[PDB]
Amino acid sequence: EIVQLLMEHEQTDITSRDSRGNNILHALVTVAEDFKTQNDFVKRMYDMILLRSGNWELETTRNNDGLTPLQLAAKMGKAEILKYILSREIKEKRLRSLSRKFTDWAYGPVSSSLYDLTNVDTTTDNSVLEITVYNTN
Amino acid sequence: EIVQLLMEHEQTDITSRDSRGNNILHALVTVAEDFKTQNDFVKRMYDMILLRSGNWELETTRNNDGLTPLQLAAKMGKAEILKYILSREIKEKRLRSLSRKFTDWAYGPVSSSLYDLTNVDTTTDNSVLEITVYNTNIDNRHEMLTLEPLHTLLHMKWKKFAKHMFFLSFCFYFFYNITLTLVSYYRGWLQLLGRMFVLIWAMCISVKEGIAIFLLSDAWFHFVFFIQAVLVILSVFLYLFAYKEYLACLVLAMALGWANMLYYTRGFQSMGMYSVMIQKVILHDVLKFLFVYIVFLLGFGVALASLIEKCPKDNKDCSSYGSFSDAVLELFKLTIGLGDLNIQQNSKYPILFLFLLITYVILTFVLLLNMLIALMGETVENVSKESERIWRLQRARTILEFEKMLPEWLRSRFRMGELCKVAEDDFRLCLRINEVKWTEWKTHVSFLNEDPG
Amino acid sequence: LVLAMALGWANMLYYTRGFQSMGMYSVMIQKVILHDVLKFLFVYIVFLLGFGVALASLIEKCPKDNKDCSSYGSFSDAVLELFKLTIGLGDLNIQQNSKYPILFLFLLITYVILTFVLLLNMLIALMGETVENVSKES
């Protein structure tokens, strides 16, 4: 409730970056732990905030360590938030451009979905796939 | 209902002590059993009565055995009532002074609670921590030392002193045993330098382990170290005196010492659980094997000696089996693969002989030796769960021993815990434990400091 | 040269990770060496070093210029002879030049018992315990 109050407030700045460089999504990633602990309310808040401000601005930024909240979830050990972020299906046709997974065609039970490799597929400098493999911590 | 009737009655005396010395709380402790049995209605009644009469009068008294209901729950095996008593959070601000656990500060999920060490932390005569460790009449002590203040008392003591005293002891014993080996192996000034220290530290081990063995399967090491020291100093006496038997006791003491390196594997988690599992395998499995095996050695020994009993005709190589000793020794060779299996002259019954030997090989190898491996495979599965707790218990007893060996001032130097003000007049030594809980959210009302630190 | 060769054939193992059936196998080996075998080798070497100086001091009497009379020379020959005995090569007999043949024999039999019927089978049980947990994550 308080989150919706603050975002609905016209003066709130959703994209604000704290002293560490983290915006709100980085913060939600550095927190979230596991299902046996938090019962997964962080994924819900992450979705809520993204859908509430339509943009790639939040998820494309970088904290002072030079990481997007996706790459940050890769550096840290957070699987439950990474599955969510890494496959998103947004059903509402307005905000559907924010999804990372799409259904190319579906007929009966058979369906061919489609995934987005931008920061994943290791055509970039440090991607999600290089981190999850070479990260020994 | 009837309890509330009696307490609400003005004439009832809540603090009455029966002929055994027990007040009502002692009585509730001597009763309560477990959750699978009573479904835990005793904890509820204990809470009800305390909250109904505000005081420390009840829980501070002593029955005729000189025990508070807390210490009594420690003597007896009662864990479920001890967790309750040992951490109490009373939310009502009036009676909050009776709690043994407090929240120093809480912000969001993070909260730092605070525990009360008064009769726990072993600054008293017989405390909750000394009892749950040294009390051998229970065998519930696994779940006893996993409770909230006790776990971190042991941990903090280890991180403060008991680690360094344990390692230091390992060094002083290790040098001792090396010098003992170098003395044993070479038999000018080396004997004068080392041998004196051998006698000295051996005498120290003998006296200390002897005093500890006068206060009596947990203490089994105290017998072994003592036996070693006796053998060492005895060998010294027989070396000063003129005798040939000194070397036997010397080398036996040495080998026994290297068998006593094992005691120091309880300082490490990975090796500690290992030596625990060995200690249980020897008890539950191997002994049964050695008994039923020795009965066969003794059977087939007299079985074969009587057949090979014919006269060697002054040829020791013709008859391979002499009296009962040579037969048993030859069978034990055969288990290793040294023994000589052939049709034997001087044995008038070579077929029966050979059959009766083959039955030995079969009963030993393909049956009774593999049975042991299967059984060990059965015990490892059950012990793998409790081994960590068992090792925590042993480590705990070592910790308390090192604590009891310190001087009064150096002991008071550490003094785990801190003074904290719980109430207006209440200052009590407390132990801080930080916690993070995401499961249940609430507005924090009862707490100690407003500013989280 | 030969040490490098043998090490190379020990390095064939690295290429078993291209196949599923052998890859999981070499993983389970890699974990067994770490969790189980090392604990065995430590507690076993401490016994070799114990009984070596135990027996050498008893057989320490002069061979009388006969190398076959005294089977145990310095600490090396004793350890080597024990390791023979584990394989079944070692020569077990009442030994001349050992002034204490009963104590000697007892102290050797205790070695055989502590090794085989106890500490070597313990390893097999523990490995049987680790294979059950590793079989899932391998």
Curated annotation (Swiss-Prot), chain A:
Subcellular location as annotated: Cell membrane; Cytoplasm; Lysosome
Repeat region (ANK), residues: 23-55, 65-87, 123-137
Subunit structure: Homotetramer. May convert from a homotetramer to a homopentamer to allow pore dilation. Interacts with TRPV1; may form a heteromeric channel with TRPV1. Interacts with SNX11; this interaction promotes TRPV3 trafficking from the cell membrane to lysosome for degradation.
Interval of the full protein contained in this chain: 276 to 412 of 790
Free-text tissue specificity from the UniProt record: Abundantly expressed in CNS. Widely expressed at low levels. Detected in dorsal root ganglion (at protein level). Expressed in the keratinocyte layers of the outer root sheath and, to lesser extent, to the matrix of the hair follicles (at protein level).
Protein name: Transient receptor potential cation channel subfamily V member 3
Clinical note on disease: Olmsted syndrome 1: An autosomal dominant, rare congenital disorder characterized by bilateral mutilating palmoplantar keratoderma and periorificial keratotic plaques with severe itching at all lesions. Diffuse alopecia, constriction of digits, and onychodystrophy have also been reported. Infections and squamous cell carcinomas can arise on the keratotic areas. The digital constriction may progress to autoamputation of fingers and toes. Palmoplantar keratoderma, non-epidermolytic, focal 2: A dermatological disorder characterized by non-epidermolytic, abnormal thickening of the skin on the palms and soles. Focal palmoplantar keratoderma consists of localized areas of hyperkeratosis located mainly on pressure points and sites of recurrent friction.
Family: Belongs to the transient receptor (TC 1.A.4) family. TrpV subfamily. TRPV3 sub-subfamily.
Positions in coiled-coil regions: none
The gene coding this protein: TRPV3
Function statement: Non-selective calcium permeant cation channel. It is activated by innocuous (warm) temperatures and shows an increased response at noxious temperatures greater than 39 degrees Celsius. Activation exhibits an outward rectification. The channel pore can dilate to provide permeability to larger cations. May associate with TRPV1 and may modulate its activity. Is a negative regulator of hair growth and cycling: TRPV3-coupled signaling suppresses keratinocyte proliferation in hair follicles and induces apoptosis and premature hair follicle regression (catagen).
UniProtKB/Swiss-Prot annotation, chain C:
Cysteines paired by S-S bonds: none
Effect annotated for changing G23S: In OLMS1; gain of function mutation; results in constitutive channel activation
Cytoplasmic topological domain: 17-19
Effect of Q30P: In FNEPPK2; gain of function mutation
Source organism superkingdom: Eukaryota
Chain ranges on the Extracellular side, renumbered to this chain: 59-70, 97-99
Functional summary from the UniProt entry: Non-selective calcium permeant cation channel. It is activated by innocuous (warm) temperatures and shows an increased response at noxious temperatures greater than 39 degrees Celsius. Activation exhibits an outward rectification. The channel pore can dilate to provide permeability to larger cations. May associate with TRPV1 and may modulate its activity. Is a negative regulator of hair growth and cycling: TRPV3-coupled signaling suppresses keratinocyte proliferation in hair follicles and induces apoptosis and premature hair follicle regression (catagen).
Disease: Olmsted syndrome 1: An autosomal dominant, rare congenital disorder characterized by bilateral mutilating palmoplantar keratoderma and periorificial keratotic plaques with severe itching at all lesions. Diffuse alopecia, constriction of digits, and onychodystrophy have also been reported. Infections and squamous cell carcinomas can arise on the keratotic areas. The digital constriction may progress to autoamputation of fingers and toes.
Subunit field text: Homotetramer. May convert from a homotetramer to a homopentamer to allow pore dilation. Interacts with TRPV1; may form a heteromeric channel with TRPV1. Interacts with SNX11; this interaction promotes TRPV3 trafficking from the cell membrane to lysosome for degradation.
Protein name per UniProt: Transient receptor potential cation channel subfamily V member 3
Naturally occurring in which organism (per UniProt): Homo sapiens (Human)
Annotated gene: TRPV3
Complete-protein stretch covered: 551 to 688 of 790
